[PDB]
Structure formats: structure tokens, C-alpha cells
Amino acid sequence: PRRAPAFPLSDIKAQMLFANNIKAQQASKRSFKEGAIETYEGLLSVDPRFLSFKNELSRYLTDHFPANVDEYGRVYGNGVRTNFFGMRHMNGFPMIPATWPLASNLKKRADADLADGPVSERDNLLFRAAVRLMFSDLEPVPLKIRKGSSTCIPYFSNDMGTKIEIAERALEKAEEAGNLMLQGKFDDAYQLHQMGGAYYVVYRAQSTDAITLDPKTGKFVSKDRMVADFEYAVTGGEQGSLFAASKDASRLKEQYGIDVPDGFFCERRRTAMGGPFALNAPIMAVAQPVRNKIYSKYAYTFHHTTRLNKEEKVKEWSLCVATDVSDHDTFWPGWLRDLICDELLNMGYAPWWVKLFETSLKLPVYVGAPAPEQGHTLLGDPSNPDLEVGLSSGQGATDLMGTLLMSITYLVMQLDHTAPHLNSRIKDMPSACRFLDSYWQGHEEIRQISKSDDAMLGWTKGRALVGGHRLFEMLKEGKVNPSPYMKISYEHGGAFLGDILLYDSRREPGSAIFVGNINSMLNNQFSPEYGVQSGVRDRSKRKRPFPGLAWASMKDTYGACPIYSDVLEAIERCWWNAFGESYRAYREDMLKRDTLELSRYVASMARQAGLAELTPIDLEVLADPNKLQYKWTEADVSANIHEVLMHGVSVEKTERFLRSVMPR
Numbered sequence: 001p002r003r004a005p006a007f008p009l010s011d012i013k014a015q016m017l018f019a020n021n022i023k024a025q026q027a028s029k030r031s032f033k034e035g036a037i038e039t040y041e042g043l044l045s046v047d048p049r050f051l052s053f054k055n056e057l058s059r060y061l062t063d064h065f066p067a068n069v070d071e072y073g074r075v076y077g078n079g080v081r082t083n084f085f086g087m088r089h090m091n092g093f094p095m096i097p098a099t100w101p102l103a104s105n106l107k108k109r110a111d112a113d114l115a116d117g118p119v120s121e122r123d124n125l126l127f128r129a130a131v132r133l134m135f136s137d138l139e140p141v142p143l144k145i146r147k148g149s150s151t152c153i154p155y156f157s158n159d160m161g162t163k164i165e166i167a168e169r170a171l172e173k174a175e176e177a178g179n180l181m182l183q184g185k186f187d188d189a190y191q192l193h194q195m196g197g198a199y200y201v202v203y204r205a206q207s208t209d210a211i212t213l214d215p216k217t218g219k220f221v222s223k224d225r226m227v228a229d230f231e232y233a234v235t236g237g238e239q240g241s242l243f244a245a246s247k248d249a250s251r252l253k254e255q256y257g258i259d260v261p262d263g264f265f266c267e268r269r270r271t272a273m274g275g276p277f278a279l280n281a282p283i284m285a286v287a288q289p290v291r292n293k294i295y296s297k298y299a300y301t302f303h304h305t306t307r308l309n310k311e312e313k314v315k316e317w318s319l320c321v322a323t324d325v326s327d328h329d330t331f332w333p334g335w336l337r338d339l340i341c342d343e344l345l346n347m348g349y350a351p352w353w354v355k356l357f358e359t360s361l362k363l364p365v366y367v368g369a370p371a372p373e374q375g376h377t378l379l380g381d382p383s384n385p386d387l388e389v390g391l392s393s394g395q396g397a398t399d400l401m402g403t404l405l406m407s408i409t410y411l412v413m414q415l416d417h418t419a420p421h422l423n424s425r426i427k428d429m430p431s432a433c434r435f436l437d438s439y440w441q442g443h444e445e446i447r448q449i450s451k452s453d454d455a456m457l458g459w460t461k462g463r464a465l466v467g468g469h470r471l472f473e474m475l476k477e478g479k480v481n482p483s484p485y486m487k488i489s490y491e492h493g494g495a496f497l498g499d500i501l502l503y504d505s506r507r508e509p510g511s512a513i514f515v516g517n518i519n520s521m522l523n524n525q526f527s528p529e530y531g532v533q534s535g536v537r538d539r540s541k542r543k544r545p546f547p548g549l550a551w552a553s554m555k556d557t558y559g560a561c562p563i564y565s566d567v568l569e570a571i572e573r574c575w576w577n578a579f580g581e582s583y584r585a586y587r588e589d590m591l592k593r594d595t596l597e598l599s600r601y602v603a604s605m606a607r608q609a610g611l612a613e614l615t616p617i618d619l620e621v622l623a624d625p626n627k628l629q630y631k632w633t634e635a636d637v638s639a640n641i642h643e644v645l646m647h648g649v650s651v652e653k654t655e656r657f658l659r660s661v662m663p664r
């Protein structure tokens with residue numbers, strides 16, 4: 001039922017994706033690569049002392065701090081939700097093979113009994129009202145670009161000057177390119193303005209993944225991660241196979257001469273896609289103003305900063321339901337892309353812009369290297385973008401796409417199962433807009449706090465409260481999916497955007513508190529996704545610019561965890577056993593070095609200014625800017641710190657661009 005066309009790298013269609021420069025040519029050909037990450041300066045993830053430390057610490061913490069999660073997935077007591085074995089991976093060595101990305105998710109959705117469009121007219125009005133509220137009265141802002149980020153297809157440039165030129169040119173030529181696509185001239189739009197082509201598939205590490213200790217055998221078992229072979233990916237699952245990837249690390253001894261201690265595994269690998277920058281720039285120019293609107297006008301539902309900021313909202317609720325979505329990005333529906341596009345056209349958005357946006361969500365994918373002697377294949381034809389991959393991670397508005405889908409999905413779930421008395425308030429578009437505007441501001445008896453696939457659903461006192469409890473019970477029973485749109489369940493150990501909701505004996509939101517997840521501290525400190533990149537001179541371009549700074553924000557971030565002190569003491573004791581050194585002193589030295597190095601990057605910071613004016617968010621972000629892509633936003637970071645990590649195209653160029661996109 002329609003296989004996607006596939007082209008080898010040798011084919012002209014794949015060759016056209018890579019410009020005549022060394023960087024682009026190397027990206028096309030990049031073979032499967034693996035190796036130990038430089039966890040910290042002069043320390044490898046596979047260092048025998050480091051692995052010995054991880055073995056002792058993971059075993060000790062699991063033993064002394066067993067999970068405290070009730071029958072309803074509510075965290076209590078110690079604030080622990082699982083064992084601590086997730087740290088037991090040979091960081092930098094992936095599971096083999098990684099998945100081939102699914103070219104079509106239509107069969108995947110149908111087989112999971114998920115809808116191929118809005119079920120009812122009410123749902124249709126709500127998805128459309130979400131578009132009207134999110135995209136209406138936007139204000140132009142500079143187009144911000146992450147320093148050291150790639151332009152991907154076709155140039156693969158990491159230079160800021162080149163990136164600024166590409167972005168400015170893209171805003172100037174977006175109209176001409178969009179109009180060519182409207183005429184079906186995709187190859188022309190790509191050849192002239194580099195708008196089209198494909199997403200470039202990079203495989204990123206998920207450094208920690210589930211591991212259990214079998215009491216019967218005393219042997220560790222890693223969570224099986226299902227992967228699709230080429231045949232399965234091109235046929236959308238009609239043909240080929242879905243099988244467990246190999247996380248067995250035994251191979252490292254034979255291949256590399258690395259000693260593999262018992263119960264250490266290869267890392268889970270996730271597909272990540274880099275968009276063609278010329279196509280992304282005009283999308284980003286609209287996406288940022290949308291985020292600014294939703295994080296201001298609809299801050300209740302969408303703007304999440306601190307554990308206390310989240311706590312203030314949740315404490316007012318009579319019931320809090322922490323939801324879980326199965327494989328959000330791969331299940332994301334193409335019918336929603338089409339509904340959004342149709343609604344933007346109805347609002348009066350430039351048709352050429354809507355076409356660029358639509359095309360960004362149908363684009364072919366270039367598969368690099370999922371395993372040795374595999375990959376280097378383009379899936380889909382760039383001459384006619386028609387893929388149904390779900391949500392591409394490198395699309396200019398992925399966060400908004402997931403947020404739009406999920407916010408409405410959860411509201412529908414609350415309406416269907418708890419609040420039929422509110423259905424009368426949604427009769428047409430104006431009434432749907434008025435209702436959603438009120439709901440998103442937290443003004444209804446049914447409420448929510450969400451970001452993409454993470455959410456907490458709330459009920460205050462009223463008619464919907466009883467229904468709220470039945471819905472929670474249906475989730476606990478786990479026999480019926482409460483949504484027609486996505487696979488929803490309850491989170492086992494309810495958390496929101498990294499903060500665990502810690503309940504007491506009462507098991508009520510009013511007496512529950514948000515605390516930092518101590519397991520995330522361990523993930524970040526001992527299992528970073530990337531190495532220190534000590535060879536990259538410009539620290540602002542590194543994936544981990546100032547790792548030492550995280551020590552200064554630790555107490556602020558994790559201090560509220562019941563076992564915070566216990567974990568720090570266990571780390572100190574285990575690090576002494578493994579290295580014969582103080583971990584605290586080691587981190588204090590790294591903090592000093594990185595504080596000194598930071599002043600070189602901040603114009604306002606005198607040669608030895610100190611961390612005085614910096615917030616805990618600023619420190620966490622400087623140590624890990626990936627937190628700025630999933631946890632926080634630009635407005636949460638001090639202006640002088642945002643400038644370290646980002647650079648922008650003038651608001652004058654974006655202001656002119658935005659005027660041409662937006663309705664009259």
C-alpha cells in the first residue's frame with residue numbers, strides 16, 4: 001500500500017542534497033562511528049575507575065533508596081521512581097542497529113486504532129481554534145540562531161556569518177520559493193533557494209535507559225528497544241521487520257580492547273533530524289513570535305519555569321493526573337499538518353508561506369549511518385514531498401506542533417470523560433475560540449499544564465471532578481485508551497518537565513510539592529549525552545560549553561529532593577573508593593575554572609566578575625544548552641547569557657518578512 005521511493009547516495013537525487021564543499025561531502029559519506037566520550041576533561045566514560053564507581057553507586061542507591069511510587073503512579077516518601085541502574089552504559093557506544101525512520105506512519109496509527117482526522121465537529125473546531133489563538137496577533141522579533149548549529153542540507157555550514165547570510169537571503173526569497181512550490185516546482189525552489197531537499201538523519205544518544213537486576217540470576221537485563229529495518233521503514237510496516245536492537249557491550253573487548261564490567265550496556269540511540277536551514281529560517285521567523293504569544297497570554301498552560309511556578313498552579317487543584325504519551329513524534333498525525341495549513345489559509349496567512357510550512361512536514365529524509373555497512377540512502381522523492389514521518393525533530397516549529405496536538409488531545413479527553421456539560425459552550429468557531437482562550441488561561445474547572453508530550457491535567461471542585469476520578473481510574477486499569485488521537489496512559493511516577501510531584505500521606509495536590517529529580521542529576525553528571533569537546537576552541541559552540549557551572553546550581557535545582565544529602569554523600573564515598581579523591585573538591589575546581597572561562601564570553605563580565613548576577617537557569621543552560629530546546633525558553637535566560645549561546649538576524653529584516661506573511 002505504497003512503498004516510499006529510496007535512492008542510494010550515488011543517485012543524482014541524493015547527490016543534489018550535498019553542496020560542492022568538504023563539510024557537505026563528508027556529511028553525505030559519514031560512516032558509522034563509535035567511541036568513548038570524554039565525560040569530563042581527561043576522563044573517558046569507559047575509564048575502569050569510572051565504571052567501578054558507577055557499579056558501586058548504582059547498586060548502593062538502588063539498595064538503600066527503593067522506589068516510592070503508589071498504585072496510581074504517585075511518587076511519595078524518598079522521591080525515587082526507579083532503580084539507579086540507568087547509569088550503567090558504555091557512553092559513546094550505541095546499540096546496533098539504530099532504527100530506519102518510518103517513511104509513513106499511516107498504518108502505524110491505523111493499527112494502534114488512532115483516528116485519521118478529527119472525530120467530531122467539536123474536535124475539528126477545537127484544533128482550528130488552537131491555530132486561531134496561537135497564530136493571530138503576533139509581534140516581530142529577531143530570528144535567533146544557536147551558535148555552532150549546522151545549516152544541514154545542502155551546505156552543512158557551522159559559521160555564524162554564513163548562517164546569518166543564508167537566513168537573511170531565505171527571508172528575502174521565501175515568497176518566490178513558496179510560489180514555485182505552489183506551482184509544483186519543488187526542484188526549482190530547492191535549486192534556486194535551497195528550500196526543500198531533505199532532513200539529514202543524525203542518531204543521538206539517550207545516555208540512560210532502563211536496566212533491571214534479575215534477583216533469580218543476579219544478572220542485569222537492559223530494556224529491549226525495537227528498531228525497524230530498511231524494508232519496514234519504506235513500507236510503513238507492511239513488509240520487513242521490527243526487532244530488538246543489540247545493547248550487548250561484550251563486543252567492545254574484542255573490537256577495541258575495552259574491559260566491559262558485568263551489567264554494562266551500549267546506549268539507546270534515537271533518530272534526530274536536521275532541517276534544511278533555508279526552509280527552516282522563514283518558519284522560525286513565525287514560530288518564535290507564536291511562542292512569545294503562548295508563553296505570555298497563555299502562560300498558565302504553556303509557560304513553565306521553576307518547581308514553585310508549577311507548584312502554585314497544581315496546589316489549587318482537587319485532582320492532578322500526570323499523563324504519558326507513547327512515541328509522540330512518530331505517531332504525530334499528518335492530518336493535523338493539513339488542518340493547521342487549511343486554517344492558516346482561512347485566517348489570511350500568505351499562501352506561499354503556508355506552502356513552505358506544509359512542505360517542511362512532508363519532506364524526504366536522508367539516512368546516514370544506523371549501523372556499520374548500512375545507510376547512505378535518501379527516503380522519499382524531493383521533487384514531490386509526500387512523506388508521513390510524523391513530526392521531524394529539526395522542523396522549525398516542532399515544539400508548537402506537539403504542543404498544539406497534545407493540548408487539544410488532553411482537553412478533548414477531559415470533555416469526553418469528565419465534562420459533557422461544557423460541550424454546549426463549543427457551538428461554532430467564535431464560541432470555540434472564547435472557550436479555549438478561557439481554558440488556556442486556567443479559568444475553567446478543567447485545567448492543564450503542558451509542553452508537547454508532557455502534561456498534568458487538573459480538576460477543581462465542580463461537576464467535572466467526579467468524572468476526573470473515573471478517568472484516573474480508567475488510566476490505572478489501563479484496558480481502554482481514553483483518546484482517539486494518541487496512545488495515552490498515566491505516568492508511573494508523575495513528573496512534569498523534570499520535576500517530580502511529591503505527594504504526602506493525603507495523596508492530594510494541595511499538600512503535594514514539586515521536587516527536582518535526583519536521578520536526572522545523576523544522568524547529567526555521570527551520563528552526559530556528549531563529551532566535553534575539549535578540541536572545540538569556541539566554548540559557546542560546544543554541546544556542553546561550561547560543565548563546571550552545574551555545581552553552582554545543583555542545590556537550587558535538586559536541594560528539595562528528600563534524598564539530596566544522602567546521594568551527595570554516597571557519591572563522595574564511592575568516588576573516594578574508585579579514584580582516591582574528593583568528588584566535591586574535583587567539582588569545586590571545575591566550577592572555578594569554568595567561572596573564569598565564562599567571563600571571556602560575557603562582555604558585561606569583568607575578567608573575574610563571578611557568578612553573582614546569574615540565575616540557576618542560566619547556570620544549568622550554560623552547562624547544558626539542550627535544556628533550552630526541551631525544558632526552558634529564551635525569556636527564562638538572562639539577556640547577557642542568551643547572547644553567549646545565540647546570535648540573531650536584525651528585527652528590521654524579520655519585521656519586513658513578518659508583515660508579508662501575516663493577515664492584513
Ligand SMILES: Nc1nc2c(ncn2[C@@H]2O[C@H](COP(=O)(O)OP(=O)(O)OP(=O)(O)O)[C@@H](O)[C@H]2O)c(=O)[nH]1
Pocket residue numbers: 205206325326327328453520523529626630
Ligand atoms: N535530560 C534529558 N532528557 C532527554 C534527552 N533526550 C530526550 N529526553 C526526553 O526523553 C523523552 C522521551 O519519551 P519516550 O522514551 O520516547 O517515550 P516512549 O517512546 O513511549 O518509550 P518509554 O521511555 O518506555 O516511555 C522526551 O520527553 C525527551 O525530552 C536528553 O538528552 N537529556
Ligand SMILES: [Mg+2]
Pocket residue numbers: 322323324454455491494495496497
Ligand atoms: Mg510527565
